[PDB]
Design a protein around this motif. Sequence first.
Motif, PDB file in Angstrom:
ATOM      1  N   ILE A 183       0.830  -1.199   0.000  1.00  0.00           N
ATOM      2  CA  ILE A 183       0.000   0.000   0.000  1.00  0.00           C
ATOM      3  C   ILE A 183       0.870   1.257   0.000  1.00  0.00           C
ATOM      4  CG2 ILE A 183      -1.617   1.354   1.407  1.00  0.00           C
ATOM      5  CD1 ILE A 183      -2.824  -1.428   2.247  1.00  0.00           C
ATOM      6  N   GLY A 184       2.016   1.215   0.675  1.00  0.00           N
ATOM      7  CA  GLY A 184       2.901   2.358   0.705  1.00  0.00           C
ATOM      8  C   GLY A 184       3.681   2.574  -0.588  1.00  0.00           C
ATOM      9  N   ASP A 185       4.395   3.696  -0.609  1.00  0.00           N
ATOM     10  CA  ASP A 185       5.242   4.029  -1.744  1.00  0.00           C
ATOM     11  C   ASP A 185       6.683   3.587  -1.539  1.00  0.00           C
ATOM     12  OD1 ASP A 185       4.518   5.483  -4.296  1.00  0.00           O
ATOM     13  OD2 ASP A 185       3.175   6.503  -2.877  1.00  0.00           O
ATOM     14  N   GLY A 186       7.126   3.485  -0.283  1.00  0.00           N
ATOM     15  CA  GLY A 186       8.483   3.113   0.043  1.00  0.00           C
ATOM     16  C   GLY A 186       8.893   1.774  -0.536  1.00  0.00           C
ATOM     17  N   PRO A 187      10.202   1.519  -0.577  1.00  0.00           N
ATOM     18  CA  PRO A 187      10.688   0.259  -1.152  1.00  0.00           C
ATOM     19  C   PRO A 187      10.186  -0.939  -0.360  1.00  0.00           C
ATOM     20  CG  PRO A 187      12.439   1.357   0.065  1.00  0.00           C
ATOM     21  CD  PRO A 187      11.291   2.330  -0.003  1.00  0.00           C
ATOM     22  N   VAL A 188      10.049  -2.069  -1.048  1.00  0.00           N
ATOM     23  CA  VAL A 188       9.577  -3.286  -0.403  1.00  0.00           C
ATOM     24  C   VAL A 188      10.435  -4.466  -0.859  1.00  0.00           C
ATOM     25  CG1 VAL A 188       7.821  -4.267  -1.980  1.00  0.00           C
ATOM     26  CG2 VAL A 188       7.411  -4.173   0.541  1.00  0.00           C
ATOM     27  N   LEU A 189      10.692  -5.381   0.075  1.00  0.00           N
ATOM     28  CA  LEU A 189      11.535  -6.546  -0.169  1.00  0.00           C
ATOM     29  C   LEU A 189      10.803  -7.521  -1.083  1.00  0.00           C
ATOM     30  CD1 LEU A 189      12.892  -7.130   3.516  1.00  0.00           C
ATOM     31  CD2 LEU A 189      13.997  -5.904   1.586  1.00  0.00           C
ATOM     32  N   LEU A 190      11.283  -7.669  -2.317  1.00  0.00           N
ATOM     33  CA  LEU A 190      10.730  -8.667  -3.221  1.00  0.00           C
ATOM     34  C   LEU A 190      11.468  -9.981  -3.004  1.00  0.00           C
ATOM     35  CD1 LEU A 190      10.442  -6.194  -6.125  1.00  0.00           C
ATOM     36  CD2 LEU A 190       8.548  -7.288  -4.874  1.00  0.00           C
ATOM     37  N   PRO A 191      10.861 -10.965  -2.349  1.00  0.00           N
ATOM     38  CA  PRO A 191      11.624 -12.102  -1.834  1.00  0.00           C
ATOM     39  C   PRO A 191      12.038 -13.053  -2.944  1.00  0.00           C
ATOM     40  CG  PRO A 191       9.281 -12.437  -1.403  1.00  0.00           C
ATOM     41  CD  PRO A 191       9.404 -11.167  -2.222  1.00  0.00           C
ATOM     42  N   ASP A 192      12.917 -13.971  -2.581  1.00  0.00           N
ATOM     43  CA  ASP A 192      13.083 -15.135  -3.424  1.00  0.00           C
ATOM     44  C   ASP A 192      11.941 -16.108  -3.146  1.00  0.00           C
ATOM     45  OD1 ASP A 192      15.139 -14.621  -5.158  1.00  0.00           O
ATOM     46  OD2 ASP A 192      16.606 -15.956  -4.182  1.00  0.00           O
ATOM     47  N   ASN A 193      11.676 -16.969  -4.117  1.00  0.00           N
ATOM     48  CA  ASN A 193      10.632 -17.966  -3.965  1.00  0.00           C
ATOM     49  C   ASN A 193      10.905 -18.846  -2.753  1.00  0.00           C
ATOM     50  OD1 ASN A 193      10.044 -16.777  -6.387  1.00  0.00           O
ATOM     51  ND2 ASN A 193      10.117 -18.677  -7.592  1.00  0.00           N
ATOM     52  N   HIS A 194       9.962 -18.861  -1.806  1.00  0.00           N
ATOM     53  CA  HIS A 194      10.088 -19.674  -0.606  1.00  0.00           C
ATOM     54  C   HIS A 194       8.732 -20.273  -0.266  1.00  0.00           C
ATOM     55  CE1 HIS A 194       8.811 -15.743   0.776  1.00  0.00           C
ATOM     56  NE2 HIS A 194       8.487 -16.242   1.956  1.00  0.00           N
ATOM     57  N   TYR A 195       8.707 -21.071   0.800  1.00  0.00           N
ATOM     58  CA  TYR A 195       7.506 -21.745   1.260  1.00  0.00           C
ATOM     59  C   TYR A 195       7.020 -21.149   2.578  1.00  0.00           C
ATOM     60  CZ  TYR A 195       8.102 -25.449  -2.239  1.00  0.00           C
ATOM     61  OH  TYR A 195       8.200 -26.160  -3.421  1.00  0.00           O
ATOM     62  N   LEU A 196       5.699 -21.061   2.723  1.00  0.00           N
ATOM     63  CA  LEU A 196       5.055 -20.919   4.023  1.00  0.00           C
ATOM     64  C   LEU A 196       4.448 -22.262   4.388  1.00  0.00           C
ATOM     65  CD1 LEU A 196       3.292 -17.459   3.746  1.00  0.00           C
ATOM     66  CD2 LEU A 196       5.626 -18.060   4.499  1.00  0.00           C
TER      67      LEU A 196
END
Length: 224
Positions: A183-196
Amino acid sequence: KGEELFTGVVPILVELDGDVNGHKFSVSGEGEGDATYGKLTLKFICTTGKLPVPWPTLVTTLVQCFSRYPDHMKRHDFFKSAMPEGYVQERTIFFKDDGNYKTRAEVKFEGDTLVNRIELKGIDFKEDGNILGHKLEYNYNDHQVYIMADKQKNGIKANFKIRHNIEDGGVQLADHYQQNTPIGDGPVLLPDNHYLFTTSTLSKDPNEKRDHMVLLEFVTAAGI
């Protein structure tokens, strides 16, 4: 970071506005989450009478930021780092040989509370199918969510199937597709593919007369 926001126990609020085949209803849930252990405890009440769908069909809709990311992927956490401004969570859930749910949620901080607020629309259901006919058992079959980065929309996506056990018979499929954007404009961590990985336990409150669901969850993240 939004990560520092999850070091202790965090109160959780969940509000859901639902409409399936024109059957309208509301669900409220509240409890708390501990991301250090990846533990969630919530109680949900249908605030409008009897729930017109089975409680297990709502579980995935009713806060993956509470998953325990171990320290070797504390950077792969899109959900936590999007806070406090939060993120949008969208899904379409196809019930095989039955209707579908469309959900749009905003998950953000309000004061010190993690709020998940949802609109759900269900269309094209069979009125005496497994869902509107309340034919699903009261239990849960967890599935792992393979979370994929999506640099185009600066968010994440995932796609998975949940199995719902049918009273008097076999299994009802719930085919999930998910996309989350910040929702924000600030940078966001685009993760590597992982599992939950999740384990959900569903139970009842013996002194609760309203239609309700008590839910205990353990969840954390894994690479590879």
